Design a protein around this ligand. Sequence first.
Ligand SMILES: CCS(=O)(=O)Nc1ccc(Oc2ccc(F)cc2F)c(-c2cn(C)c(=O)c3cc(-c4cnc[nH]4)oc23)c1
Ligand SMILES: CCS(=O)(=O)Nc1ccc(Oc2ccc(F)cc2F)c(-c2cn(C)c(=O)c3cc(-c4cnc[nH]4)oc23)c1
Ligand SMILES: [K+]
Lengths: 118, 118
Amino acid sequence: YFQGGSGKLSEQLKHCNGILKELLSKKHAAYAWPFYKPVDASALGLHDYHDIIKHPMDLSTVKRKMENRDYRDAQEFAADVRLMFSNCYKYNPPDHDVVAMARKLQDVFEFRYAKMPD
Amino acid sequence: YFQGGSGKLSEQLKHCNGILKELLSKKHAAYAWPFYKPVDASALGLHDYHDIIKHPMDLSTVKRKMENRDYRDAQEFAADVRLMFSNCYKYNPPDHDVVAMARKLQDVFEFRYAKMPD
Ligand SMILES: CCS(=O)(=O)Nc1ccc(Oc2ccc(F)cc2F)c(-c2cn(C)c(=O)c3cc(-c4cnc[nH]4)oc23)c1
Ligand SMILES: CCS(=O)(=O)Nc1ccc(Oc2ccc(F)cc2F)c(-c2cn(C)c(=O)c3cc(-c4cnc[nH]4)oc23)c1
Ligand SMILES: [K+]
């Protein structure tokens, strides 16, 4: 209900915003879709999720934070994206399909984040 | 020449120290060894390395920083380990052997880092 953030993004944050658009794009939808919204622990029957995962994260939350101008630098953006993957790796056994998807999405993220303009 | 850091590690930093020890252990030496010391750009003939990579990182530097009590929290430790991998992904073509090694080492890192006590 207070004013939302707005302003130009820094050069490094434009790079991050580009990454975000790519992670949300049709290019990666086959493996990105489980990360499009918060994990709905109630609907999926994951009654231990919120006991194991203290800081839930997903791409819709990253998108709202970018649009709101919450991120002040690239490191802060990267930390949220990585948190989203870490949560998946913490909660799930390593042979789960959703873990395979997370690893693929993370390869996309890591390879492009590494090309940060200096 | 001034005093080195010393002090107890927080619980989360003990977890990070444990990860560090594992990354330096014989368990992972077949793919960790290129990260044991800074990239010696002179010796390897990589005369563009320091133009592309602004913040070099390697496991010996992470080790000295942990021993010196440089890291104040787990996120700071993770940022350096991840930076080491990112540098590798930035500099090298994605089919290079050293990239394959980096990905394997990063999988070891990410899966264990995700089990952060909290
Ligand atoms: C769009 C978010 S949502 O509204 O909560 N819907 C949703 C739907 C399916 C999910 O998981 C799967 C994805 C692909 C797959 F092959 C199997 C899944 F269980 C998941 C899912 C996402 N993540 C990030 C997870 O870590 C887990 C774990 C589980 C899970 C379901 N049953 C056991 N574990 O489901 C998800 C989520
Ligand atoms: C222990 C650090 S060191 O003293 O500088 N020695 C060292 C030795 C070999 C290295 O790279 C390779 C490792 C395995 C392999 F199969 C091929 C390599 F080129 C590398 C190496 C490490 N990293 C992190 C890199 O990104 C690259 C890139 C290259 C490289 C060499 N020739 C073209 N690219 O070598 C390294 C380093
Ligand atoms: K990070």
